Swiss-Prot record, chain B:
Its main location: host cell. This is Protein C42. Keywords: Host nucleus, Late protein, Virion. It is found in: Host nucleus; Virion. It comes from Autographa californica nuclear polyhedrosis virus (AcMNPV). Forms a complex with proteins E27 and p78/83. The interaction with p78/83 mediates nuclear translocation of P78/83. Interacts with protein Ac102. Interacts with IE0. Plays a role in host nuclear actin polymerization by recruiting p78/73 protein that is capable of activating an actin-related protein 2/3 complex to initiate nuclear actin polymerization. Belongs to the baculoviridae C42 protein family. It comes from the Viruses. The chain holds residues 208 to 334 of 361 of the full protein. GO terms for cellular component: host cell nucleus; virion component.
Curated annotation (Swiss-Prot), chain E:
One of its GO terms (biological process) is symbiont-mediated perturbation of host cell cycle progression. Its main location: virion. Acts as a cyclin-like protein and plays a role in the modulation of host cell cycle. May promote G2/S arrest by interacting with host mus209/PCNA, cdc2 and cdk6. The cell cycle arrest is characterized by an intact nuclear envelope, concomitant with sustained activity of host cdc2. However, viral DNA replication still occurs in the arrested cells. It is found in: Virion membrane. Belongs to the baculoviridae E27 family. The keyword Iron does not apply. Keywords: Host-virus interaction, Membrane, Modulation of host cell cycle by viral cyclin-like protein, Modulation of host cell cycle by virus, Viral envelope protein, Virion. Interacts with host mus209/PCNA, cdc2 and cdk6. Forms a complex with proteins C42 and p78/83. The lineage of its organism: Viruses, Viruses incertae sedis, Naldaviricetes, Lefavirales, Baculoviridae. This is Occlusion-derived virus envelope protein E27. GO terms for cellular component: membrane; viral envelope; virion membrane. The gene is E27.
Curated annotation (Swiss-Prot), chain H:
Belongs to the baculoviridae E27 family. This is Occlusion-derived virus envelope protein E27. Interacts with host mus209/PCNA, cdc2 and cdk6. Forms a complex with proteins C42 and p78/83. The chain holds residues 38 to 145 of 290 of the full protein. It comes from the Viruses. It comes from Autographa californica nuclear polyhedrosis virus. It is found in: Virion membrane. Acts as a cyclin-like protein and plays a role in the modulation of host cell cycle. May promote G2/S arrest by interacting with host mus209/PCNA, cdc2 and cdk6. The cell cycle arrest is characterized by an intact nuclear envelope, concomitant with sustained activity of host cdc2. However, viral DNA replication still occurs in the arrested cells.
Length: 254, 127, 212, 192, 72, 48, 53, 108
């Protein structure tokens, strides 16, 4: 549907006319609905769960990662998550990198503090590192499942008028999805800008904004971690140890 | 008094580790459409919680300018600029911003009210 | 006479937070510390834990010597208290947390801290990257890979129905806090400086990514 | 030559508003000020003086104005009034102003249709932005004048029902309201 | 009760349950029709106020900016 | 009600002007108006 | 420097930072509406090109 | 005579910049100021007023400018931006200026 507007000035009978197409306003309104974005995120998570299900991966993720002996399931789960994220970024390639190897880490002695899934080149083939105890500690941590994070009127008006997926399981799925999303961002910088840039990014995540917004911000969908604005409680007080009398002329990351 | 002091002490919070705090990215509205009046009430309640800032003008006199040369010079510079196009652009950008805010706010747009806004034309012409 | 149940519940919650085994963010007061210490003292099979946490009052007095059977028994005691894995590093986290809580002065507003003083080799992120780096390549991979993305409308509808009552914001909060706590514990255990500038810049990157 | 006389009217009024904005001691052009959320004082001064200019035009016998104004610069959507970027009222005799900065920025940043030696020149976009801000503050002043003349209740009802612009604007003060540039044009919306 | 019921019958259950928690909508949903057609309301015979209302209300005070003060 | 009123009267200090208060601290479940609306709400419809 | 500064004010610190590395924003973000305004700059009175040889 | 008119344009603009620099109360010629690393105030004033002059030329309706400016005079290579001897920006509404003195000295 189209809406027409007419402007008339008091010096003549001239009328200048413009046509507005309502679809743009409808799209903005739909993008402003909380239920719409919630449905988008939940549909992404549901597609992830369905993708795991068709790969027999019905067992809870914590149970999958708790099995030390069976490495094939862990490798398949991580590879499938990487492929799902890759398809989300590029909705044209259904198969991930056709050949890559997996190594599972069970020791702190060879563990990376903060990047549980890491990628490296052995001069012959891609290799992916999986820190199994880190993922186990992530998924096994007790979750806050009774607290409320900030409509009562619609509830009042209403009052006057089969796979068993618990909340813990869904939170575990989302946790693994976000972790593999971080790993995939690192891997994307790797594959597209070299090992040097990948190891530069491992120590400074601020290069993501420059090496993603050039291509991803205008071609792919929205990232899962962008659904909410995350901040550290009392960040300024803790950061007060490292304060600079700064002069920022290349503040490329607000 | 010692009991009251101990009561104040035992309610003192202790150290806690940091947590990741979630902030709403965009003020996403709910499914049910709202009218202008309820939206006005809610937004006025929200504005009430804000902290106003004091503005102090240098003097009470209305700002003005009686420099002829500057006035005819601005007039000459904007002389080749049609009033029809200028007023059309201004009205259409006002309308587009209003409609965009209505759509984002999930509020119903009353076309009749917006039309009634600009009826001072005929009010002037007839009287 | 004291109420064993209330003190046990307060101890359970405070230890859950102070062990980084839970993301439940409940404002803890001095009363909870008093209750947890009193319960630890009174219960016979938590005497080892009570002495362990009481030794933290003075920074110069460090952990009591425990033979392997004693450490195993204390681990079982902690597991029973939490009814949940739990190992020695959890006990180290608890010791550091309680030491910092005890040595902290009485104050009106909750003090926000980060995990520190757990587990000689004070390193940074890059040396760990290199070092552990090879220790990785040293290991041979286990699996070689050399993809169905089904859009079954009914199946996704049922999945959405199951997921619909879940408060997405709570799930995101739980996942993000879990990742943050795991990263912080790995940093502290590895004796590597945790640069919260980088971690916050991750979120800043996401925020800057969205608006383009 | 009557149409030329009316165009001279309107353009001279716009030029006088331009010269007032010049005298107000501005560091940046209007749009530039409105994208500068760090400096709310300049935005408040611009809005306040546009209100004062409109007040003098509507009431030619009034030569001064209040020297104080409580103002809030809206930044978030959940504290913005759609269709009313600027709103004026007063409580306990103190002028109260609310400015929706992102809305005005979007208004002035739209792409407008565009069918001597000292280097002075004024672009069409700048003049149209000037007229747009004048019109917005002028709508705000219409609501403000309804407030003063018929109570905060008539003000609140007019905020939702704009027919008070044609009912409560009596023909006795038609010459007074004709001084407003908002009265020089008509904008209608027709479904299609 | 009848004022609540009138808002109910004329503006829906949603508006009725909104009014139950906020009586301030009465002024907008009555003055549009009742203030010019019906008689005077019984509770309007006298101006009722709570003794020392400001002191008791001091617990809930806002650094306010009221631009839609539809109820003086 | 009497117990709460007398407790607040006794613990109040001697003062020159009468202190105006509201009833409080009588009768675990600290609620608001809307939850009560919903809750008691059905308990109503439950009755025929 | 003022061209970079004006890009900053008119399109964000990000457009400023991107223009610091990619100077094509001098011809993209400089719309023709303000061509008379930018013609006031003496930088617009000349062209400097670099050709390999 | 249009080319003469354009040359008059450019040269009058340059002369007006010259006269502004004269009014700014200079002790030494430009190059001389820029080799004087001991007096950063004069270099900052020159750069700031040239920015203000350009701002007025680009925005003829703007007659004043901010009276404060945080500035750093670059001396070493490891804090100099190639190709951008002077850079302007602002943070929390405060103008921020960076001047690469050796680069400008080599330029002049």
């Amino acid at each position: 549907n189209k809406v027409r507007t007419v402007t008339e000035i008091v010096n003549s009978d001239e009328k200048i006319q413009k046509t507005y197409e309502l679809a743009e306003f409808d799209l903005k309104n739909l993008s402003s609905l909380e239920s719409y974005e919630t449905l988008k995120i939940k549909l992404a998570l549901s597609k992830y769960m369905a993708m795991l299900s068709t790969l027999e991966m019905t067992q809870p993720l914590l149970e999958i990662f708790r099995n030390k002996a069976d490495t094939r399931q862990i490798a398949a789960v991580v590879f499938s998550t990487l492929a799902f994220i890759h398809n989300r970024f590029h909705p044209l390639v259904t198969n991930f990198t056709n050949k890559m190897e997996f190594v599972v880490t069970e020791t702190n002695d060879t563990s990376i503090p903060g990047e549980p899934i890491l990628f490296t080149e052995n001069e012959g083939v891609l290799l992916c590192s999986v820190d199994r105890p880190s993922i186990v500690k992530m998924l096994s941590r007790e979750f806050d499942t009774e607290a409320l994070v900030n409509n009562c009127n619609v509830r009042i008006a209403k009052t006057f008028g089969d796979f068993s997926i618990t909340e813990v399981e869904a939170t575990q799925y989302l946790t693994l999805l976000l972790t593999v999303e971080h790993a995939y961002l690192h891997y994307y910088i790797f594959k597209n800008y070299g090992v040097f840039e990948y190891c530069k990014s491992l120590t400074d995540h601020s290069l993501f904004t420059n090496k993603l917004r050039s291509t991803m911000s205008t071609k792919t969908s929205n990232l899962l971690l962008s659904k909410f604005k995350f901040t550290i409680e009392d960040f300024d007080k803790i950061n007060s140890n490292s304060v600079t009398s700064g002069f920022n002329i290349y503040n490329f990351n607000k | 008094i010692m009991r009251s002091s101990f009561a104040r002490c035992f309610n003192s919070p202790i150290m806690r580790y940091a947590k990741i705090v979630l902030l709403q990215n965009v003020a996403l509205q709910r499914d049910k459409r709202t009218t202008l009046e309820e939206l006005l009430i809610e937004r006025g309640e929200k504005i009430q919680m804000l902290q106003p800032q004091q503005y102090i003008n240098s003097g009470t006199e209305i700002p003005f300018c009686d420099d002829a040369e500057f006035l005819n010079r601005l007039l000459k510079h904007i002389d080749p600029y049609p009033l029809s196009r200028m007023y059309y652009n201004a009205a259409n950008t006002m309308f587009y911003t209003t409609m965009e805010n209505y759509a984002v706010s999930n509020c119903k747009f009353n076309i009749e009210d917006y039309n009634n806004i600009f009826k001072v034309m005929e009010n002037i012409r007839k009287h | 006479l004291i109420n064993m149940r209330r003190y046990r519940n307060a101890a359970r919650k405070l230890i859950h937070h102070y062990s980084l085994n839970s993301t439940s963010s409940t404002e803890y007061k001095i009363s909870d510390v008093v209750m947890t210490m009193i319960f630890l003292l009174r219960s016979e099979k938590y005497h080892s834990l009570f002495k362990l946490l009481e030794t933290t009052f003075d920074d110069y007095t460090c952990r009591p010597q425990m033979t392997q059977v004693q450490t195993d028994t204390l681990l079982d005691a902690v597991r029973s208290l939490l009814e949940m894995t739990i190992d020695l590093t959890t006990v180290d986290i608890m010791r550091s947390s309680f030491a910092r809580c005890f040595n902290s002065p009485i104050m009106r507003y909750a003090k926000i801290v980060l995990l520190q003083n757990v587990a000689d080799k004070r390193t940074t992120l890059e040396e760990l990257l290199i070092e552990r780096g090879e220790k990785i390549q040293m290991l041979q991979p286990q699996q070689y890979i050399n993809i169905p993305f089904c859009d079954d409308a009914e199946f996704l509808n049922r999945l959405l129905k199951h997921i619909d009552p879940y408060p997405l914001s709570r799930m995101y909060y739980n996942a993000a806090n879990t990742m943050f706590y795991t990263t912080m514990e790995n940093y502290a255990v590895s004796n590597c400086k945790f640069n919260i500038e980088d971690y916050n810049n991750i979120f800043k990157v996401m925020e800057n990514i969205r608006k383009h």
